[PDB]
Amino acid sequence: SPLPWCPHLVAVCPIPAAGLDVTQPCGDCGTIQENWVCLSCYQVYCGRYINGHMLQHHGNSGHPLVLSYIDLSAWCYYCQAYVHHQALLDVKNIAHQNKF
Ligand SMILES: Cn1c(=O)c(CCC(=O)O)nc2ccccc21
Numbered sequence: 001s002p003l004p005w006c007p008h009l010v011a012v013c014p015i016p017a018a019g020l021d022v023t024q025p026c027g028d029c030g031t032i033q034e035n036w037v038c039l040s041c042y043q044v045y046c047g048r049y050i051n052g053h054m055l056q057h058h059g060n061s062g063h064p065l066v067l068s069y070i071d072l073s074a075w076c077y078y079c080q081a082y083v084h085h086q087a088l089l090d091v092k093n094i095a096h097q098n099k100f
């Protein structure tokens with residue numbers, strides 16, 4: 001199971017009214033693969049197995065929690081774990097509707 005809570009959920013920000021585009025490419029390298037969206041600032045960057053731009057974004061912003069456009073899991077870089085909570089249901093659901 002993911003963690004049912006983490007102390008960084010307070011940094012999850014409201015979903016843009018434009019919604020989410022789960023096919024949006026990495027904002028740095030343009031890859032279509034393994035992208036995540038930041039749940040603070042809603043920038044999209046690639047995963048560790050591509051070019052690691054979301055990890056870079058975490059390092060230079062401190063933003064904690066990111067949502068996968070592959071499986072709609074949410075990862076906290078500080079807690080080094082997946083997290084699921086009601087504060088994440090709306091954003092997951094918007095991504096699920098856009099994806100599927
Ligand atoms: C298991 N795991 C993850 O799922 C993620 C997702 C986010 C990313 O790819 O940037 N990052 C990790 C970063 C270090 C260690 C483990 C990690």
Ligand SMILES: [Zn+2]
Nearest residue numbers: 026029046053
């Ligand atoms: Zn990238």
Ligand SMILES: [Zn+2]
Nearest residue numbers: 038040041063
């Ligand atoms: Zn961010």
Ligand SMILES: [Zn+2]
Nearest residue numbers: 006008076079
């Ligand atoms: Zn956390």
